[PDB]
Ligand binder design. Structure first.
Ligand SMILES: CC(C)n1cc(C(=O)NC2CCOCC2)c2cnc(Nc3ccnc(-c4cnn(S(=O)(=O)C5CC5)c4)n3)cc21
Length: 302
């Protein structure tokens, strides 16, 4: 019926990698910064180590996440490097040194221009289109779940809820009412993600309890038009929030729409001091022991 999943699950020795410091902690668990020094391979790979107490239910959930994360392979999606089998199972992933996109847009607002915002939209749509090709429904797309490798390269992560074909404020109305999840319900969440970027990290429907959201959507209320957004960009966000799921754009169409806009960004987003803004590039001073350091994107198979 469905094709065999021949993805390799790499088991990494505790001795092969080190924790440096905690990068973040919360409901999602705890994520540490680290260095992976494999075999006699003469490489140092910057890594992120995730662990969501030693309980069998936690280990079951993180292995479900590992299953999905080891099965993906796209430049705009985060792949699992391996797992470490300690009392609590750890996920070994690529270090995304600029953290999540949500915090990034709040912290770097004054230096984020139309080109960056539109390019991020294309990249998120590319990653989501890839997950659709792989018949995977994310079920938790949000700006918090998009990580920043460099300011010009973002990837989708957090496969903890991903399934083959509760964040109410990012959910499609069918998802809230009937628990119906599809690629088109992911498109709704994509629209909310775009709204989060265009508002430089605003909280969707702020102050409104999650219990009131379904009723607000049924009345026909939607997230407001962000100040920087032209009707062209807002109309796209609005189509992602249509009641009829089949009336919403497809990720392949969102790639096209945002790409055309990305060719003339100042026509589609109005930002004071645009094009005069600067963000860190891998061609800048002190962007990167240093010797033998290889990014995970350049470290292919053992
Ligand atoms: C706490 C997290 C968001 N974090 C903060 C980082 C970091 O470097 N932060 C610094 C940024 C610059 O300022 C100082 C902190 C950082 C760097 N690299 C990764 N690496 C990956 C790669 C692939 N997947 C994941 C992953 C999967 N699930 N989750 S999660 O459960 O945490 C999800 C809800 C968000 C993360 N992490 C995660 C990182």
């Amino acid at each position: 019926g469905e094709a065999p999943n021949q993805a390799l699950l790499r088991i990494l020795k505790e001795t092969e990698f080190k924790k440096i410091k905690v990068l973040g902690s919360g409901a999602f668990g705890t994520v540490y910064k680290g260095l992976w020094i494999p075999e006699g391979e003469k490489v140092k790979i910057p890594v992120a180590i995730k662990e969501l107490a030693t309980s069998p239910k936690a280990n079951k959930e993180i292995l479900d996440e590992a299953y999905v994360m080891a099965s993906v392979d796209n430049p705009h999606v985060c792949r699992l490097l391996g797992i470490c089998l300690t009392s609590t199972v750890q996920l070994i992933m690529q270090l995304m040194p600029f953290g999540c996109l949500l915090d990034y847009v709040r912290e770097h607002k004054d230096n984020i221009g139309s080109q960056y915002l539109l390019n991020w939209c294309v990249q998120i749509a590319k990653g989501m289109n890839y997950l659709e090709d792989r018949r995977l429904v994310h079920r938790d797309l949000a700006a918090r779940n998009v990580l920043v490798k460099t300011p010009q390269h973002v990837k989708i992560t957090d496969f903890g809820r991903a399934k083959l074909l509760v964040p109410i404020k990012w959910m499609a109305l069918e998802s809230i009412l009937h628990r119906i999840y599809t690629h088109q319900s992911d498109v709704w969440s994509y629209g909310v993600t775009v709204w989060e970027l265009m508002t430089f990290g605003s909280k969707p429907y702020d102050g409104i309890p999650a219990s009131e959201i379904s009723s607000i959507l049924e009345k026909g209320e939607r997230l407001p038009q962000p100040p920087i957004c032209t009707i062209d960009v807002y109309m796209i966000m609005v189509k992602c929030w249509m009641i009829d799921a089949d009336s919403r754009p497809k990720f392949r169409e969102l790639i096209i729409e945002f790409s055309k806009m990305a060719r003339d960004p100042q026509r589609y987003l109005v930002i004071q001091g645009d094009e005069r803004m600067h963000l860190p590039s891998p061609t800048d001073s002190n962007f990167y022991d240093m010797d033998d350091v290889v990014d995970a994107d350049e470290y292919l198979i053992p």
